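Try it yourself: sequence plus magnesium ion, in.
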Amino acid sequence: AGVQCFSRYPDHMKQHDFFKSAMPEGYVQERTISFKDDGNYKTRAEVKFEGDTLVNRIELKGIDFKEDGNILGHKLEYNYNSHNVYITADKQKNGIKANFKIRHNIEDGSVQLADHYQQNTPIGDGPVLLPDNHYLSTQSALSKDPNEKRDHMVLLEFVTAAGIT
Amino acid sequence: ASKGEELFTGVVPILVELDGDVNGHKFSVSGEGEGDATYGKLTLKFICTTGKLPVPWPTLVTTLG
Ligand SMILES: [Mg+2]
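Structure, out:
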């Protein structure tokens, strides 16, 4: 969910795709990710084109984590549950907001909730598309490269916009 | 659709760069891959360039992915 400009918007919803409308100048994306009974991430990112390449540059700050919580204690399974991202316009910032819940699987069979609140605003001056309410349906598959000795993650994701007929 | 949508009709290369600080544990991640919005499809590989990531990879997917 860092480069939501790669979502598939169905043709009948294309007037609701803020993310691509902000390109190439791009958008700022900010989140607060609150891990239930643990700490939080605050993130600020700028997503924009640099020539023909889509670039996502992020600063992440995490505070108030428990030293042997699920996060700093590495108690989460290496997998990822499908979910929806619920988008609404923020006319006042000429942008969008989103809210959604991520449920990480704990190795003991339980779940670690990560509440997400998100705000996006354009970097450029050109007109953008302010959407009606809708959601992004996301699926992500996490894997490893068997020849990579560095700490890493291989990700395959599919995302489709939905919720308007 | 918008003018910007025209930039996404084919495969677009992606670069991701993250600097992080979680409870004082500092780290950086670099990612590379490509997106094909026609199919809603993203393929990315991330490397922690500072050593061991001090948080689980899944907790960064919404930020990095
Ligand atoms: Mg309407």
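One thing you can check immediately is this: Residues 29 and 49 of chain B are 6 Å apart (CA to CA).
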